[PDB]
Amino acid sequence: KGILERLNAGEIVIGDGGFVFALEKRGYVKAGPWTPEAAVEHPEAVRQLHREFLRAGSNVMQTFTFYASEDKGQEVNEAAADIARQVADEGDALVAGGVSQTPSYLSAKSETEVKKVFLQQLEVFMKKNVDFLIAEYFEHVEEAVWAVETLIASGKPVAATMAIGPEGDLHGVPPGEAAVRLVKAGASIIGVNCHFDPTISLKTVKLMKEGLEAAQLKAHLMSQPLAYHTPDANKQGFIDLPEFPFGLEPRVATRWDIQKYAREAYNLGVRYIGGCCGFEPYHIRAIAEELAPERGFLPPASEKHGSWGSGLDMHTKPWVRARARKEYWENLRIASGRPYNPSMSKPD
Amino acid sequence: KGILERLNAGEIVIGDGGFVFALEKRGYVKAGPWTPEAAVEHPEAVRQLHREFLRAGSNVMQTFTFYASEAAADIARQVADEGDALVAGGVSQTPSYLSAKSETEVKKVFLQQLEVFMKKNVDFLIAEYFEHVEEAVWAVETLIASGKPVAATMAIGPEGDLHGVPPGEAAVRLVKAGASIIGVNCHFDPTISLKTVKLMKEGLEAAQLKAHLMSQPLAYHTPDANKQGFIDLPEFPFGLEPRVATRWDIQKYAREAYNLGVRYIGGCCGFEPYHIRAIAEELAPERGFLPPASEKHGSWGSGLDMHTKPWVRARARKEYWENLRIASGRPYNPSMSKPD
Amino acid sequence: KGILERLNAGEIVIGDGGFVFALEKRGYVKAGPWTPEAAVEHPEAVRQLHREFLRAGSNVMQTFTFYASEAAADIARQVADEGDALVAGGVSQTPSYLSAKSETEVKKVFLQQLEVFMKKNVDFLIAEYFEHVEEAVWAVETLIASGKPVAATMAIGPEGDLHGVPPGEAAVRLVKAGASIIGVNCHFDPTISLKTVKLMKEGLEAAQLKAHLMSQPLAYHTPDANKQGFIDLPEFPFGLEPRVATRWDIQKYAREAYNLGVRYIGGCCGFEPYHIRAIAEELAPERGFLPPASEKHGSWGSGLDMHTKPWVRARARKEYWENLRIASGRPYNPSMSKPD
Amino acid sequence: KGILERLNAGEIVIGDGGFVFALEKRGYVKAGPWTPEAAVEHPEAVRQLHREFLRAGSNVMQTFTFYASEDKGQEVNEAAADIARQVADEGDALVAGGVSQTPSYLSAKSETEVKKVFLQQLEVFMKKNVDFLIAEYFEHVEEAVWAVETLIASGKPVAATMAIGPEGDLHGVPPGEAAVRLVKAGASIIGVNCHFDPTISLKTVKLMKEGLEAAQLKAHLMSQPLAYHTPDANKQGFIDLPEFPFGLEPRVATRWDIQKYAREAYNLGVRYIGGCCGFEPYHIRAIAEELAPERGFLPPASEKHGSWGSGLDMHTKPWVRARARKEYWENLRIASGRPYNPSMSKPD
Ligand SMILES: N[C@@H](CCSCCCCC(=O)O)C(=O)O
Ligand SMILES: N[C@@H](CCSCCCCC(=O)O)C(=O)O
Ligand SMILES: N[C@@H](CCSCCCCC(=O)O)C(=O)O
Ligand SMILES: N[C@@H](CCSCCCCC(=O)O)C(=O)O
Numbered sequence A, D: 001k002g003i004l005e006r007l008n009a010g011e012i013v014i015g016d017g018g019f020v021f022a023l024e025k026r027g028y029v030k031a032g033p034w035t036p037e038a039a040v041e042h043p044e045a046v047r048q049l050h051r052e053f054l055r056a057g058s059n060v061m062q063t064f065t066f067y068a069s070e071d072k073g074q075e076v077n078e079a080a081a082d083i084a085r086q087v088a089d090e091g092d093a094l095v096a097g098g099v100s101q102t103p104s105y106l107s108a109k110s111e112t113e114v115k116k117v118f119l120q121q122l123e124v125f126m127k128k129n130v131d132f133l134i135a136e137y138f139e140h141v142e143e144a145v146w147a148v149e150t151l152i153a154s155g156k157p158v159a160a161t162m163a164i165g166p167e168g169d170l171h172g173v174p175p176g177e178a179a180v181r182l183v184k185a186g187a188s189i190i191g192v193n194c195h196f197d198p199t200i201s202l203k204t205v206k207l208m209k210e211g212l213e214a215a216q217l218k219a220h221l222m223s224q225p226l227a228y229h230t231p232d233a234n235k236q237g238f239i240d241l242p243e244f245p246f247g248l249e250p251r252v253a254t255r256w257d258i259q260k261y262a263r264e265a266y267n268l269g270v271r272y273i274g275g276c277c278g279f280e281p282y283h284i285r286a287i288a289e290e291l292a293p294e295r296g297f298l299p300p301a302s303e304k305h306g307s308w309g310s311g312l313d314m315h316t317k318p319w320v321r322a323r324a325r326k327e328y329w330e331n332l333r334i335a336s337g338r339p340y341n342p343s344m345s346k347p348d
Numbered sequence B, C: 001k002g003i004l005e006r007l008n009a010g011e012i013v014i015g016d017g018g019f020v021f022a023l024e025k026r027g028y029v030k031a032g033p034w035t036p037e038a039a040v041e042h043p044e045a046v047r048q049l050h051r052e053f054l055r056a057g058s059n060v061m062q063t064f065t066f067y068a069s070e071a072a073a074d075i076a077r078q079v080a081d082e083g084d085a086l087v088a089g090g091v092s093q094t095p096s097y098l099s100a101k102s103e104t105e106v107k108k109v110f111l112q113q114l115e116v117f118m119k120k121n122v123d124f125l126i127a128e129y130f131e132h133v134e135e136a137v138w139a140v141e142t143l144i145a146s147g148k149p150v151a152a153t154m155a156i157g158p159e160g161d162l163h164g165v166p167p168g169e170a171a172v173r174l175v176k177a178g179a180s181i182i183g184v185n186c187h188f189d190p191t192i193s194l195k196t197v198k199l200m201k202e203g204l205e206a207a208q209l210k211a212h213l214m215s216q217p218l219a220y221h222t223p224d225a226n227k228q229g230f231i232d233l234p235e236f237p238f239g240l241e242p243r244v245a246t247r248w249d250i251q252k253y254a255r256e257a258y259n260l261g262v263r264y265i266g267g268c269c270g271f272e273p274y275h276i277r278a279i280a281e282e283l284a285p286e287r288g289f290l291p292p293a294s295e296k297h298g299s300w301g302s303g304l305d306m307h308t309k310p311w312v313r314a315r316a317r318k319e320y321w322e323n324l325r326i327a328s329g330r331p332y333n334p335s336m337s338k339p340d
């Protein structure tokens, strides 16, 4: 089924994880420029990541095309698109052509320049026939809207997610307003992605939801937060924290943190539930297992976890076996293991 | 160049990471049993991980045979062939000794595996993850009886094995049983691990015995662990996330290991490709080259020097990441827990 | 020199600490009721505390009359007479407004106390610990009707009073009701407190109104508190120990308060004599003198320069204590809690 | 009753708190030299502290004579002694003449010099007729023993407490041995004081106890630990921690931590239960209330606390009232309130 049909059919769409961060850790991406050349340099590495996400329950394979626009090549987009489709066809998933904020917009290159960059990328996805489009990682509504108006042209479903928190985009536009302007432009799915942990992200989504309601408008809700806890981030997101991007390890969410996220996202009415930087395959599976009752099945990766925490029953040690209760893991306040370190830092 | 060759020549041999923890995360292993059944069910998954480690700088592709005892050895062989790497057949403590069971039954389990590595001709062997010096000894005795060099590492800390046997004595009895390479693996973080290796190294020296040192610690900080290691921590094995070492923690470990005289420097549970790469980069001057994966990195954050924000560009340097006391991001959580 | 004199002359008036929390610790007050009944039961206890604050540098001996409404005023008078100090008659929010009860009943409670301070001739008055701008207003209205200068501080943070009234507006209505000195006291740590004072100061300025600023924050760090303050924290009031500010935290607060334009610098719950002394020492250059208690101290650890151990002597300096991120000593505990 | 009679009568002797630290905070003592001149300069300040401890349940008023020996005056000792007796006579307490380690011993001034300093102080206590003697704050057994042999001369009861942890004194003598040599010399009460928190302190006392048992010897057990948590201290004690002595605030024990300490001390067989640096009057009262059932009564300060945590019942706020349960406070993992700070530091 398609994306709007799935959603409308009352289904829960599970997104895929954070590619650049995941690939960076496996040795195929360079932190800093965070570019997707691995699609052509090392396709097997990209293909395997897609499969792990697919095996974890993702219903979407986003094209590894983050920062794959020009003035930042076209062979990459195409190669990425192929791998994504190549992998999607292996299960119940759709390919999603994605575009992000652009340098051209940042360097103040008026409004006719950027859309050309967007269209420049939209072209490959159309010739590749992707199932729908995502305008993600946008800190400015105006550029977000411009990207939407460009992608709707393809006549396909377009999702738009803002990299903003409860306080608004860089120009001061609250999330409620951002959601409206985004829907008034064509997006049938609106959400938030990156910059903040699941908790803060859902607060953002709640505000967008209420903004739409007060606008008598409607659209599917989507969320792809960081898998890193960020109680210390200011409105600028995790990038401003001292540990970005090489000391974020201690902040990584456990699978239990993500199941809680999925449950709250569902309760909020979010139906496209994914993740961004920090999300590894097991985090996506966490979304899948937690909402198994609401969906109707379990993903293939659950064959290596399945038993909710009860997998420890096959443990050779007694103490580990006592932790085979699901409420044990969901009530446990895990230790950081770094007593000589602080629990929060101040944004730069 | 075999394992003993490189070592004797005074070379630094980089090990691979922790396969079962890594694959569990990716969806191919089951936490609890921790079996390598994926070696036949999803070879490309096991193959890709091997390749990532190879690309990160590993000189050893340990056969995905922790526990159990099939096509794993082949995969390991195929990837080692793609670079400067050797295949290692490994055997871990048996659940047989777990349920006690004499010396006969144990060496039976081991022998079956050795014949396999015997048939696929591995470069050397690894008596791995042993909590009792005695069971580790029997393993070594069976392995040496194949001609291939044998490495033996204990899953014990400064207090010794689960029988009260000190690390120094433990090491002694390991070498006296034919071990050319000894050390530690798993159970404790890099810091506690090197304390243990130091003890072993001192017990060896006190006995006029010589042997190459090896270390494959957890990539998890465990200042709160007791003599039983991290499995006893309440967070094992599903809430260990916060404890994972940064690439900088690993570079510090690599230097220290090197300064201690360790030349078989690897990692265990928790170690992902970038961690191995950290070893290779930290010791790049010594070894004289950078691993392939370094083309996708920067020295101590160098890769960030072109980022848009000033304070992020400011992080493109050694002086920054090695002094940064990173935040846990969990103010409502404790920093340590009590074993059990 | 009266309270308004010193202030108008641009002098820095140092307040005293938190009597009820201090006495509770010493065994003279009851946590829960927090009544000043000790003023008649154990005068020397109340007297000694006043003296310690006076010796630490306080220029105001607030009458031990928080809640209730006797011999307290005398004690306060006697100690102020022993130094450069004034007596302050204080009245706090009534449990009457708590149980609602009109404007008549409340001003009745206040009036009884004002007559007392009226009869013992206090230097000035303090409308203290008010969570609602309205009830604080009535208090001020009754107090100004005595001729003595009136100071009014709210037990609210940046989000305003428990009715939704912003700090700026709250301050406005306080001055418009006769308050010559306004500010905040209790509920939040020094940092959140000065954020609140800044708001008040901005609401005052926006209204072309002028008045001396005052601050008496908790000596407890409360980064986790919500708009209701520390009473809502799970640790209130018996597990607050870890949150207590060091003398260095207080010196930082004192400087910041001063830079903000606050000239009535004091403290509330948690403030012990050495905390007050920290205010006096940090601002010693400005004020031009050190309090008597400074003969038993050293600037930024100077007093340790003769200690036997090297690393302790090393701590005899500013550059050390102001940069030191002190450990909690409780690794099995969280660093923040959730209100309720 | 006397000290050995009290103890022998199955009674629990409650010590007094940490004077120099308490006085330092109130403005009468100078951190660094930590000397007791306040006895003469400001007696009312000293007298009031003694009373607070007496009111909290202390059965002993130690003479504010720490670092009051010569080459570090005699009027101070006498003045202190008077205040202590002056206050003791106000209740069920004894006066205890105390002596600590000496500079003379540190500067290697042989064995005949030091005892003279000790005797030089013993003289005032005898002429003042103190109830018994305490040789406290000793990091070297040998000097501890020398002080004992000198104080027993007075024919009075002598208690000896070591400022050492589970690992032994500065010369490497384990606690077990230290306890023997201490009893073989005259002390009828042996213990530990200062340097470590209550938990580590009791571990030290357990080792001294077992040492005595293995020596077929016996003596009353005593403990006066710091009221500061020190899980990060090495065998040198809290002095080597970066925060000594001006940044120790966050480590201060709550009254609940101390009640747990008192209970465990009692269970270990300790009968002289006190405290050292960090202990304020409410900490001593905590010892008193916790062992009320084993003693038979409550101290006078309990009239301002009494109800075990149930004092919140008279609180004007609901939430506070819900914390009037004793098990609430004893299970609560209190927050440090400093998320930007570490939980442990490394000894210098
Ligand atoms: N769909 C993408 C989203 C990446 S968001 C990456 C933010 C990087 C910020 C920076 O420029 O440093 C992915 O899966 O990686
Ligand atoms: N070479 C092996 C070492 C595995 S050590 C795994 C310890 C598991 C403990 C448990 O059974 O829970 C690997 O790479 O995984
Ligand atoms: N000037 C007074 C201010 C007291 S503010 C006390 C707040 C108590 C809150 C409660 O009722 O628990 C003092 O010095 O104590
Ligand atoms: N009985 C005395 C014991 C004091 S122990 C003080 C240790 C100080 C260490 C130093 O010299 O800095 C008291 O009650 O203060």
Ligand SMILES: [Zn+2]
Pocket: A018, A193, A194, A195, A276, A277
């Ligand atoms: Zn992202």
Ligand SMILES: [Zn+2]
Pocket: B018, B185, B186, B187, B268, B269
């Ligand atoms: Zn392991």
Ligand SMILES: [Zn+2]
Pocket: C018, C185, C186, C187, C268, C269
């Ligand atoms: Zn207060």
Ligand SMILES: [Zn+2]
Pocket: D018, D193, D194, D195, D276, D277
């Ligand atoms: Zn002490």
